[PDB]
Design a binder for this molecule. Structure first.
Ligand SMILES: Cc1ccc(C(C)C)cc1O
Ligand SMILES: Cc1ccc(C(C)C)cc1O
Ligand code: NA
Length: 123
């Protein structure tokens, strides 16, 4: 799996690909990585772009939870891995409450952060 430094480098590259498509500032993006979620549609759709870049958005506009779990297994350092997977399982039905795909990814991500803020990270 990646080290935490490598994981951050990977997340930074995903941010650098997706952030230009949305009216999202460093304050908004750093806050999001830190588990603070501005209620801003541009930030919600940024989270969907990140899920799309990870290849975890199906073409129906839903989150592929099994693919997300397989990525965390492969990529996350062990102090993060089992906790991230338990968070993902816990939050797997949040997306069913939202019609809009940017809502699905934003609120699913916020569920992961609330599950354990010390483990949580996001691009
Ligand atoms: C949404 C999302 C962000 C980062 C990663 C990797 C960098 C662990 C996977 C993923 O599915
Ligand atoms: C179940 C579930 C999958 C992916 C994500 C994020 C990583 C997009 C959150 C979540 O709660
Ligand atoms: Na856990």
């Amino acid at each position: 799996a990646m080290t935490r430094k490598q994981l951050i480098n990977s997340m930074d590259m995903m941010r650098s690909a997706c952030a230009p498509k949305f009216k999202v500032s460093t304050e908004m993006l750093d806050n999001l990585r830190g588990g603070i979620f501005a209620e801003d549609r541009e930030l919600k759709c940024y989270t969907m772009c990140i899920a799309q870049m990870a290849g975890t958005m199906n073409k129906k506009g839903e989150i592929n939870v099994q693919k997300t779990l397989a990525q965390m297994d492969a990529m996350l350092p062990p102090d993060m891995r089992d906790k991230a997977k338990e968070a993902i399982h816990s939050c797997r039905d949040v997306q069913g409450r939202y019609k809009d795909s940017c809502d699905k990814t934003f609120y699913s991500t916020k569920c992961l952060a609330e599950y354990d803020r010390d483990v949580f990270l996001f691009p």
